Write a protein that binds this ligand. Structure first.
Ligand SMILES: [Mg+2]
Ligand SMILES: [Zn+2]
Ligand SMILES: [Zn+2]
Ligand SMILES: [Zn+2]
Lengths: 107, 654, 112, 171, 10, 166, 87, 97, 267
DNA sequence: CTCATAAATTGCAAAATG
RNA sequence: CUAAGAGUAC
DNA sequence: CATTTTGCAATTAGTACTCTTAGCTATGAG
């Protein structure tokens, strides 16, 4: 994770994607002053393992696209370091049932 | 009689596959080439052969069968013709798309500008959906203006790899009306990109290139976006004075003949260009007359021509005016009036409307006698029958059939008869903003000219009686009847999913009356008690012991009203400041179906959550709740009739 | 969090005039609007752009343009939507149509 | 030649036909329609194997119809002619244009152009036959013929045969 | 674009 | 796929393009793949006889050429009803051109041709045509060219001709 | 079809007949009764095909099965006999 | 009387699919049109009394099907084909859900 | 616009809420799988009241005197006191109730106790009381073990999802957790024995009725919840410092970058 | 003398510079 | 018959 | 390396009723 003060030069963004499996993630200090995940609006996000994703798609008979989508630019997706194809489990305090579990696939 | 039997297998459409007509497909499917712009021959009594109304595309007269399929106008789908255009023209709907495609492929060698050697092409081609692929490819290759006969190597930017590029420079392409003009960089060279050269360059696009652009090998290739053989819809599409499409096709044929003669006889290039532009304009206005910038193709009467796009789009187009919503038979509409003596799920149907709207009932050993009697009665008295459909498909109308004598009905036939009592009929008040505004009622035939519905059931419909009109739809099969009665029945709709509370209640006079009836001061003598008890249809037949026995037997209003409330209902609401004793008689306590205390008013019998309606329907069922509606309205309306309630100017005076 | 805010906005709209709508209706609305990862508006530029079938996309707005784009892209419409089966005049796979009714010969014989 | 293949047929049953003998009705109605029939896709169809328990499946009520649409799957024995296949047969008729040979359920017409120059028609004989220098082809005569051309029709499959090749003729 | 959906441009 | 129109090579036994649905492997009604077996004339006759006697027994509970023809005619008339003209012609064609009598000989033939490890169409044609020599078999069935050795084919047709009876 | 058909031993749907299932069962059965289908229940004088279907369903004498389609295309076969009509 | 869009929507919310189909097909316009399985277009010449179905171009006479669609739908498809769009109608699934 | 947007949403047979494409909108309808028409407003007693009041209402101790029980409440009122097994059962039951109290206080920041839930327990309790003629003076026939095991078994019997794997079981527990919290709030041993004074047959009948009503309130697969929601939102719109009503509904559905009155809330 | 033709949303590719 | 227009009902 | 700027049309509650008018005008030529 690279943390910058103000911005990154455009000539530096192009070389940010290095040789795999090394991944570089850029975050702004101003955007990291407040942790978004502690907001009451923000529910609990838990990254799923590959085995868990396979079990999810098996049990719910889903395809990759039939899951709810989460952009690979969402502040929470950047926060937890999601890569495309990884499914997050969302625990939400519902008002009709106490707990509701959703699943969002990164796109 | 409908349509006669066909031996072709019957299936339901599972997948609708779109695409573009290939010109050879248009030539193959066409049954008659159209060559002359006239519609009728010189005799004016037959359809001209070779004209726009060739009988091979479908007969225009009932007395004549279609020349191709040897079937009448009732059966013939209408078969397409084809006009072989003298020169290719743009499709008006695809011009922009065409532009984009010709902005992505080299205009000389006919190959895509940036193959996978370019950095972003791997990401662009990795996209799955065709539309996003094309969007990325266009937005990346639109700024590239060279075919790049030699490109830097993917391994390293030192050596040069030569691909199948001709090395020319692609132009900047703009649209000037119905044509595309290209400006090549000056070594600018501005020239109109003729449809012939664009069609040529599209026919040179490799399969991989255009399937990466989002096109398909089989269904829609890019070169099919340029028209060379225009399909001619049959006269069924443009019935006849002639239709607007007929005149537009006549104009197209006239322009095509003009250009063809100028080509064959030889002519200056300017006249050829003018004829080509006129042909393009006529084709575009035939397919779209609302082109921005260009003037509308006006009709012979001075009005804009109705193009096909105009026929499709809009509220009155095909989709929204004839497919999403369409005019239907077996429906009535008239003024609505209230009737406190009707059940909640009942609707009053005028005798005339019942005599008009009909239901087909299949002849069964169980209903042979009654349908036979209805047939004997005929269609001019109610109840009766209007038609008999035999197993052979022949229809017997009860009018003019009495001469042939009585009809011996056979099992399996249909008797199409007047809608009678207890027929599930969909009842609707428009705009019909929710599902409760369209509910299944039971027919009660009445001897007057208005629809009659319970006062409560007006609340879901948002219906008054100051001139409102309502619609009545009759199912024409046992399946639709059954699911209408078992899913759309009014009692099943009492509790709305809209707010998990009842949508109907006691309203208007009854509500006022019930408040006046359940006051502590309200005491009822023996005779009025007997009448009110009898007015409850499901009264158990035992007179409750009066609230006061000596010196005069007086029943309170709460005691009599508790007869309407079904046995076994417990309700306990505490209003503002009420105690277990009620100094203000507010609140509500009902124990085992007897109103222990509380004035019965809007909060109790109205459409409120936790009220009497909700409790009754959740405990005993929707049918018992409808029965409760009827009983409460009956008893309260009788009491208010014999008590009276008015209002005047003095009521507004302090 | 955007979906939660959208539900709160819709609920405040519903409750401004004192009316009450069940939670699950507004929850379905906000979940449909945010099932694509972003706030999909209820507009011709919003839900109508999703690749959900040309015949039902055109039934709302921009009919002829949708038909042209489907023809150009050779779209395959699977006729799963309500509007597709409404247009083609066939029982939509909804409500009573969300299943198939078939016949058991063995049970019919076992009855008698 | 003779093969056995999987076939599927869609049968529609009226509401009045649903009784304890529905399976018997479906089994009988599969017969009389495909037994000994002919189609262009699979040639002739002679009989159905394993009649003890044929796969009938469940059926499906057509909405607003009530008639059930069964998709009955079965094993059918077929005789599909193929191009360039040698097969024995029996001559049943002769004419100027050629002669007909009985192969299974079908008749193959060998034209007069497809016999050696020595063989010639002879109508003087009763019945008329084909006489050559070394052999004669008459009625009810065994003959081996190679099919070299087939036209695919549904109600009646047609094949074109010949005996011009070596070791083709009367056995 | 257009208008609607000037140009581009102008 | 759903390719509109269809371009296909002409059916040719020598080229072994029996058809797109006449390939070696076919998915059965159980969902698995089985080889496309081809029944020779004697084997097909025996299969038809077994099916017809099974049908006759089910309905009941619910050799020389002349006597065999009489028996098959009686059984066919007893088992099925009408539209059997094609079935009768095929049955008499099979009985007349019957290369084998009973189950043991046809089983021996089919297991020998399986041990040859050859195509089912080709082995069925070999069991159907009463060939004598090796080059004769090669010229009768072009598909056998450059597939099997001369001596092995000659000897196996020798045993096949030996197994011919009546 | 074999891959699609979920075996009876592991059907994961509700054993209770839904309102839509009951509505369609009643509609189909009433239609068949109207078209002279055999009746498996004794009649106490009823003549309406709909109430005939209701009486048939009351004692589970309807010879039909629901084929409930999962969103993936897989289906479960629930015989009307083993479905419990609670509503 | 008009069975408008939102009336259809109310019948959808009620879940009565067969009643909606009856409203939009039997009560208004039910049209039997023929197509071929090769090309899903309605370019099938039908001779019902002579029992001959033939789609010219595809060179087929046994790969035909009949479908029941509203005449408005047939007219829409005809105007689409007249406008160089092929709404091919296929009676089997070429893809999984 | 709302109807067209939501026209293809449907509850499928696996209880998920999917559109025409098969995309999952909700993994269970309404996040609890309940039909909207079968929902009534009820009070959650665990969340309300004070810690001392909650203890007095629910805390049961067989070893002390501050939170003991009257022996006349039940048949074995003088035998249970001093026991260890039933004290363990009450200890875990009260710990579960404390957990429910904390959970519900977490779910609702404002502590609102009246919320819409499928099955109305109060009406069933009153029906049993009026059917079995509870006299409120006779010692109860029930035993504590019966009450605890019956409540636990009833919670196990409320099935929304019938699947047979860990994901489906977790989803089922998540779907029924709030209704189970309500059920424990109402059918507590203290409340059953003292406030309501259920008998043995009456308790069994209450359990059976709760199970039946909950299984009856589950949403029906094939339900067109999309059009239902669209109409249920649009119908109140017709009856209609910060913009509200129809203009605000338009501002929300048409997700507009610029809106008339953008206001921000800071705590 | 009669037939034939003259509010509010969206949706950007240029063109210029220093 | 079609199209356009005007007025009107809820 | 950093901005920057610009020009506008299509689509937008349901049904339902009644009545009124008009359908290329004028000129050439066989
Ligand atoms: Mg009014
Ligand atoms: Zn025709
Ligand atoms: Zn080039
Ligand atoms: Zn075709």
């Amino acid at each position: 994770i690279f943390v910058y003060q103000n911005n990154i030069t455009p000539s530096a963004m192009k070389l940010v994607p290095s040789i795999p499996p090394a991944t570089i993630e850029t975050f702004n200090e101003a955007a990291l002053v407040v942790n978004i995940t502690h907001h009451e609006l923000v529910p609990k996000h838990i990254r799923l393992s590959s085995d868990e994703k396979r079990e999810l798609l098996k049990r719910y008979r889903l395809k990759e696209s039939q899951l709810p989508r989460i952009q690979r630019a969402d502040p929470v997706a950047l926060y937890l370091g999601l890569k495309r194809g990884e499914v997050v489990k969302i625990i939400r305090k519902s008002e009709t049932s106490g707990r509701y579990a959703s699943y969002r696939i990164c796109m | 009689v409908g349509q006669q039997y066909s031996s072709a297998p019957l299936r339901t459409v599972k997948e609708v596959q779109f695409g573009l007509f290939s010109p050879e497909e248009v030539r193959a499917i066409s049954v008659a080439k159209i060559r002359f712009p006239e519609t009728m021959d010189e005799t004016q009594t037959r359809a001209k052969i070779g004209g726009l109304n060739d009988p091979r595309l479908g007969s225009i007269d009932r007395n004549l069968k279609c020349q191709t399929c040897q079937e009448g106008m009732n059966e013939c789908p209408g078969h397409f013709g084809h006009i072989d255009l003298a020169k290719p023209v743009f499709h008006v709907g695809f011009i922009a798309k065409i532009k984009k495609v010709c902005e992505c492929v080299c205009m000389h060698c006919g190959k895509l500008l940036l193959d996978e050697h370019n950095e972003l092409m791997r990401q662009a081609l990795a996209i799955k959906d065709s539309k996003k692929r094309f969007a990325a490819i266009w937005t990346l290759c639109k700024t590239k203006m060279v075919c790049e006969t030699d490109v830097p190597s993917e391994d390293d930017p030192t050596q040069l790899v030569s691909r199948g590029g001709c090395g020319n420079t692609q132009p900047t392409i703009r649209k000037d009306g119905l044509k595309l003009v290209g400006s090549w960089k000056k070594d600018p060279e501005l020239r109109v990109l003729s449809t012939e050269e664009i069609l040529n360059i599209f026919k040179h696009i490799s399969v991989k290139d255009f399937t990466s652009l989002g096109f398909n090998e089989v269904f829609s290739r890019p070169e099919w976006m340029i028209l060379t053989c225009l399909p001619v819809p049959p006269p069924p599409v443009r019935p006849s004075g002639e239709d607007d499409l007929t005149f537009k096709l006549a104009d197209i044929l006239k322009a095509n003949i003009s250009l063809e003669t100028l080509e064959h006889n030889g002519a200056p290039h300017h006249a050829i260009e003018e004829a080509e532009s006129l042909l393009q304009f006529h084709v575009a206005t035939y397919m779209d007359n609302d082109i921005a910038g260009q003037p509308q193709a006006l009709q012979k009467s001075g009005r804009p021509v109705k193009s096909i796009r105009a026929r499709l789009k809009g509220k009155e187009g095909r989709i929204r005016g004839n497919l999403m919503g369409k005019r239907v038979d077996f429906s009535a509409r008239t003024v609505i009036s209230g009737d406190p003596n009707l059940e909640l799920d009942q609707v009053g149907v005028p005798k005339s409307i019942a005599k008009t709207l009909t239901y087909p009932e299949v002849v069964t050993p169980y209903n042979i006698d009654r349908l036979t009697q209805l047939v004997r009665n005929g269609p001019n008295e109610h109840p009766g029958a209007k038609y008999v459909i035999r197993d052979s498909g022949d229809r017997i109308d009860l009018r003019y059939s009495k001469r042939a004598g009585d009809i011996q009905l056979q099992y399996g036939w249909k008797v199409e008869r007047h809608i009678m009592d207890n027929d599930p009929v969909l009842f609707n008040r428009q705009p019909s903003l929710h599902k409760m505004s369209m509910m299944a009622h039971r027919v009660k035939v009445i001897p007057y000219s208005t629809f009659r519905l319970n006062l409560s059931v007006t609340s879901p419909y948002n219906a008054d009686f100051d001139g409102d009109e309502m619609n009545l739809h009759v199912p024409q099969s046992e399946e639709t009847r059954a699911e209408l009665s078992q899913l759309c029945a009014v009692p099943l709709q009492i509790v709305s999913p809209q707010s998990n509370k009842p949508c109907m209640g006691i309203v208007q006079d009854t509500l006022c009356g019930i408040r006046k009836l359940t006051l502590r001061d309200t005491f009822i003598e023996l005779d009025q008690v007997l009448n009110m008890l009898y007015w409850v249809p499901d009264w158990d037949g035992v007179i409750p012991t009066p609230a006061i026995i000596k010196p005069k037997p007086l029943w309170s209003g709460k005691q009599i009203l508790s007869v309407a409330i079904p046995n076994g209902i417990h309700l306990q609401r505490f209003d503002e400041g009420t105690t277990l004793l009620s100094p203000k008689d507010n609140g509500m306590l009902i124990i085992d179906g007897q109103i222990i205390f509380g004035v019965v008013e809007k909060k109790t019998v109205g459409s409120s959550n936790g009220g009497l309606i909700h409790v009754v329907t959740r405990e005993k069922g929707p049918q018992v709740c409808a029965k409760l509606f009827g009983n409460i309205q009956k008893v309260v309306n009788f009491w208010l009739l014999h008590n009276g309630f008015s209002t005047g100017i003095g009521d507004t005076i302090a | 969090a955007g979906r939660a805010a959208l539900y709160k906005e819709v609920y405040n709209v519903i409750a401004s005039d004192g009316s009450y709508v069940n939670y699950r209706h507004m929850a379905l609305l906000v979940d449909v609007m945010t099932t694509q990862g972003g706030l999909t508006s209820v507009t011709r530029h919003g839900f109508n752009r999703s690749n959900t079938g040309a015949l039902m996309r055109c039934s709302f707005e921009e009919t002829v343009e949708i038909l042209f784009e489907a023809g150009a892209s050779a779209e395959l419409d699977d006729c799963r939507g309500v509007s597709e089966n409404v247009i083609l005049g066939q029982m939509a796979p909804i409500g009573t149509g969300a299943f198939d009714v078939m016949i058991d010969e063995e049970s019919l014989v076992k009855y008698m | 030649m003779f093969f056995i293949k999987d076939l599927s047929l869609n049968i529609t049953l009226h509401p009045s036909f649903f009784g304890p003998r529905m399976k018997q009705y479906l089994k009988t109605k599969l017969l009389e329609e495909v037994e000994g029939s002919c189609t262009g896709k699979f040639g002739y169809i002679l009989c159905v194997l394993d009649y003890d328990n044929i796969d009938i499946q469940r059926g499906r009520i057509l909405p607003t119809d009530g008639s059930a649409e069964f998709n009955v799957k079965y094993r059918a024995v077929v005789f599909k002619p193929f191009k360039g296949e040698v097969v024995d047969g029996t001559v049943v008729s002769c004419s100027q244009h050629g002669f007909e040979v009985q192969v299974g359920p079908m008749k193959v017409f060998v034209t007069k152009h497809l016999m050696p120059q020595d063989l010639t028609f002879n109508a003087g004989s009763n019945p008329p036959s084909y006489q050559s220098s070394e052999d004669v082809i008459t009625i009810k005569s065994r003959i081996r013929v190679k099919i070299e051309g087939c036209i695919s029709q549904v109600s009646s499959i047609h094949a074109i045969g010949s005996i011009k090749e070596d070791y083709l003729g009367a056995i | 674009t257009x208008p609607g959906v000037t140009x581009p441009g102008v | 796929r759903r390719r509109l129109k269809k371009v296909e090579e002409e059916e040719n036994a020598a080229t072994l393009q029996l058809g797109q649905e006449f390939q070696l492997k076919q998915i059965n009604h159980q969902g698995e793949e089985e080889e496309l077996i081809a029944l020779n004339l004697s084997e097909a006759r025996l299969v038809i006889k077994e099916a017809l006697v099974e049908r006759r027994r089910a309905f009941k509970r619910s050799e020389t050429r002349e006597k065999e023809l009489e028996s098959i005619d009686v059984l066919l008339e007893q088992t099925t009803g009408g539209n059997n003209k094609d079935l009768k012609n095929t049955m008499q064609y099979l009985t007349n051109f019957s290369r084998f009598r009973d189950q043991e000989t046809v089983g021996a033939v089919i297991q020998l041709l399986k041990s040859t490890g050859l195509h089912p169409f080709e082995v069925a044609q070999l069991g159907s045509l009463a060939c004598d020599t090796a080059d004769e078999a090669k010229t009768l069935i072009p598909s056998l060219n450059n597939k099997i050795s001369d001596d092995e084919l000659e000897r196996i047709l020798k045993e096949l001709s030996n197994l011919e009876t009546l | 079809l074999k891959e699609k058909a979920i075996p009876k031993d592991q059907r994961a749907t509700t054993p209770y007949m839904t309102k839509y299932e009951r509505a369609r069962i009643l509609g189909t059965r009433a239609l068949q009764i109207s078209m002279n289908a055999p009746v498996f229940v004794d009649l106490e004088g009823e003549t309406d095909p709909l109430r005939i279907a209701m009486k048939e369903l009351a004692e589970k004498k309807i010879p039909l099965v629901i084929r409930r389609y999962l969103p993936d295309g897989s289906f479960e076969d629930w015989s009307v006999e083993e479905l419990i009509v609670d509503l | 009387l008009r069975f408008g869009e939102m009336e259809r929507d109310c019948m959808i919310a009620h879940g009565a699919a067969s009643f909606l189909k009856e409203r939009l097909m039997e009560a208004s316009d039910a049209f039997r049109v023929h197509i071929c399985g090769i090309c899903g277009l309605m370019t099938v010449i039908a001779k019902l009394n002579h029992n001959q179905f033939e789609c010219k171009g595809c060179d087929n006479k046994i790969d035909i099907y009949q479908i029941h669609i509203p005449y408005a739908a047939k007219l829409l498809f005809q105007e689409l084909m007249a406008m160089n769009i092929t709404p091919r109608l296929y009676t089997d699934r070429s893809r999984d859900f | 616009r709302l109807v067209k947007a939501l026209e293809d949403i449907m509850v499928h047979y696996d209880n998920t809420t999917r559109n025409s494409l098969g995309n999952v909108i909700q993994f269970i309808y309404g996040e609890d799988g309940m039909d909207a028409a079968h929902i009534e407003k009820q009070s959650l007693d665990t969340i309300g009241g004070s810690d001392a009041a909650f203890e007095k209402r629910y805390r049961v101790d067989l070893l002390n005197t501050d939170h003991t029980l009257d022996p006349s409440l039940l048949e074995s009122g003088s035998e249970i006191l001093g026991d260890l097994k039933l004290q363990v059962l009450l200890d875990e039951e009260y710990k579960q109730l404390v957990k429910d109290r904390k959970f519900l206080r977490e779910v609702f920041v404002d502590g609102e106790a009246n919320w819409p839930l499928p099955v109305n327990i109060r009406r069933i309790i009153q029906n049993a009381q009026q059917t079995f003629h509870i006299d409120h003076t006779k010692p109860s026939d029930l035993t504590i073990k019966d009450i605890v095991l019956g409540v636990k078994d009833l919670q196990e019997n409320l099935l929304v999802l019938r699947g047979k794997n860990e994901i489906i079981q977790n989803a089922q527990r998540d779907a029924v957790t709030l209704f189970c919290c309500l059920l424990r709030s109402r059918l507590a041993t203290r409340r059953v024995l003292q406030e309501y004074r259920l008998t043995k047959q009456a308790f069994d009948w209450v359990l059976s009725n709760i199970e039946a009503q909950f299984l009856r309130s589950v949403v029906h697969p094939g339900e067109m919840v999309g059009v239902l929601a669209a109409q249920s939102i649009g119908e109140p719109a017709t009856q209609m410092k910060v913009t509200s009503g129809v203009p605000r509904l338009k501002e929300i559905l048409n997700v507009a970058k610029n809106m008339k009155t953008p206001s921000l809330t800071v705590y």
